[PDB]
Amino acid sequence: FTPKHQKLVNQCYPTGRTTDKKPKSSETSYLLYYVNSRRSKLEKVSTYLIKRSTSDLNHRRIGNIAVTLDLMNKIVLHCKENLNVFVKDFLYIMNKVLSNNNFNNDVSVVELIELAFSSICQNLDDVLCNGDMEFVQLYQNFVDLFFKIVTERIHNDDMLLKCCIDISNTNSVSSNPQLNHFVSKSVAYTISKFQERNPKFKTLSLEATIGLDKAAEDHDLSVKALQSYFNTTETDKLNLSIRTLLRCLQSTPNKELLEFVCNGIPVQLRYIVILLLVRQLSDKDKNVNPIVSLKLMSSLLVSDVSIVGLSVLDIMRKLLNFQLKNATNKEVVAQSCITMTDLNHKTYYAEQTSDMLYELLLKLKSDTVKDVEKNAVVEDIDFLVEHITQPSISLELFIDLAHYMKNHIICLFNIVETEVPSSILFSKLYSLLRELDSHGVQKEMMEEIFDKYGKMALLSGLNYFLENVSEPEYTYYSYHLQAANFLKLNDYKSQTEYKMQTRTLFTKEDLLSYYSDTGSNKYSKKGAQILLSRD
Secondary structure, three states, X not given: OOOHHHHHHHHOOOOOOOOOOOOOHHHHHHHHHHHHHOHHHHHHHHHHHHHHHHHHHHOOOHHHHHHHHHHHHHHHHHOHHHHHHOHHHHHHHHHHHHOOOOOOOOHHHHHHHHHHHHHHHOOOOHHHHHOOHHHHHHHHHHHHHHHHHXXXXXXXXXXXXXXXXXXXXXXXXXXXXXXHHHHHHHHHHHHHOOOOOOHHHHOOOOOOOOOOOOOOOOOOHHHHHHHHHHOOOOHHHHHHHHHHHHHHHHHOOOHHHHHHHHXXXXXXXXXXXXXXXXXXXXXXXXXXXXXXXXXXXXXXXXXXXXXXXXXXXXXXXXXXXXXXXXXXXXXXXXXHHHHHHHOOOOOOOOOHHHHHHHHHHHHHHOOOOOHHHHHHHHHHHHHHHHHOOOOOOOHHHHHHHHHHOHHHHHHHHOOOOOOOOOHHHHHHHHHHHHOOOOHHHHHHHHHHHHHHOHHHHHHHHHHHHHHHOXXXXXXXXXXXXXXXXXXXXXXXXXXXXXXXXXXXXXXXXXHHOOOOOOOOOOOHHHHHHHHHOOO
């Protein structure tokens, strides 16, 4: 007695004892039809494949096993929408084959095995991923055996790369606890085998077409694996992939590798990398060099790699805070002093630069912070302004900041492009200008202030310095000098020189004599106005 399924399945096999057996065409077609018709047939046919392939394992016939694996592949592909019926069976058989040292040798067997595995992984439902435990152990066993065999008996790293791609193509493995580690070990292996070929990325370059998007033209399999694990919108997979990347990057620090893999990662959410890098500082591991991660952040932020939608403020605040907690090191303070500005390298929005500086100012104003935080922030603003190429300051911020570092105010002033300031802001500016260490700084400051706002500085300076100054100071005389220089008046300059070399002050009348004729001074009317309209 031979039931139909048994006869069909057996009818798919050739007669001999050869090892290059390919399943007979028409018979396997009709078999596929038969199992695809009613799902009751898949049960029978799959179970029968288990028993039969067991007998073929015993009598040690490779051909029948090859045909078997081929059939299994074709069935998986044909009966996808019912895959959860027979997957555990096929996996049991594949593991049983792999567990057999008489079938491990043959390369074709392992090839067909991997093929069946790829066709499986590509069509899985999360149903067994989460519900069934036996399936989890069969999958686990398969991956373990496959690595343990290909590494030792097949000696074909390409097989392992294909397996990594299979795991990557499996549904929600990165979202599964029991099967999580396989993603990590896969990424680790493809990385280490991508640093094996192209050993350039094994270099210790950490300070100073390349893209992966253009490297996917096809070719090396390692790159295909990288694209498989990094070029993805699946957040979990990318989480684990990046984490493993950073981990394998602590051992072989390479900025170009990071650049490459980032070129692989979808442009949209690359910010996540940075986040993890930042988190890498907060980590308690102690086998992680924070300096390495900082330099890697820097290397990333400087280059062409677009990092859309970065929470610049948040990241900066985190870096700064980390620098304040550990502030007694040249490395923790300087590499942060560098990365912090390296992050401003690109302008995500106009308010950012100001905001950055502002975040520091607020920390400086409070007396809660320790001396070394003061010093560190000072050096930070120092570096920032040293790297701020073009103007972006609200004059008030320039004032609050000016109070704290009188050495680098000039530079800060070159960043203020407020075309029109308030009349009070002027008096503030002057009032702080009076409180300055050197007269050189006061001189050049007065000069540039006049340069930017000739009319407004003339008038506001006139009023202010007339009212407030009651004793010979440098700022007073420098104002009158710059005013005379702006009005191109020899008598004004001469008199100022007198009042300066004799420590005397100007009176309302003396200054009135310069704002007398509109043909001699364009601004005579407003000047005289504010000169006599007060007291």
